[PDB]
């Protein structure tokens, strides 16, 4: 009851809240969300290193926004055989991208984190650390041929 001293003992909706521009203030440089891209020809190696960096972020009290995989890219090797003037299929190489999306970080802990990451890079895995932009957000998304052709009609 409201007039009883035990009012609000069952209040629980304030304990759970379930219904990005970098903050650059100079000294508490708590910047925005960042993509850690991991590009590899080895799917298992890429997945393992993404899992490792995700667990490291979890242990280091880093707010992991996301942990996703970008669409694969299948390069085709066309080698010119001997005597030349030809081109034959050699192999297919499927490169895979695993991206960890982190929320906030400082300069000091960013330096330490990056140091750990490039000390613990596996072999044949390309690292990338970028800020989250509209191009990086639309990379996961398919093209819009209808929108592009209409915009061409507009222009």
């Amino acid at each position: 009851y409201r007039s009883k001293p035990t009012h609000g003992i069952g209040r629980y909706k304030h304990l759970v809240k379930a219904q990005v521009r970098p903050i650059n203030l100079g000294t508490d440089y708590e910047y925005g969300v960042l993509n850690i891209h991991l590009i590899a020809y080895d799917m298992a190696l890429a997945e393992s290193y993404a899992q490792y960096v995700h667990n490291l972020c979890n242990h280091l009290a880093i707010k992991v926004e996301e942990s996703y995989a970008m669409p694969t890219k299948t390069m085709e090797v066309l080698q010119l055989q001997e005597q030349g003037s030809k081109m034959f299929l050699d192999a297919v190489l499927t490169t895979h991208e695993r991206v960890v999306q982190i929320s906030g970080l400082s300069a000091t802990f960013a330096e330490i984190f990056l140091e750990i990451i490039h000390s613990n890079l596996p072999e044949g895995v390309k690292l990338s650390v970028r800020e989250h932009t509209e191009e990086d957000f639309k990379g996961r998304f398919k093209a819009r041929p209808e929108l592009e052709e209409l915009l061409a009609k507009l222009n």
Binding site: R2, S3, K4, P5, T6, H7
Partner: peptide, 8 residues
Amino acid sequence: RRAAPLGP
């Protein structure tokens, strides 16, 4: 009417 809790 509100009353103060008798403890934590």
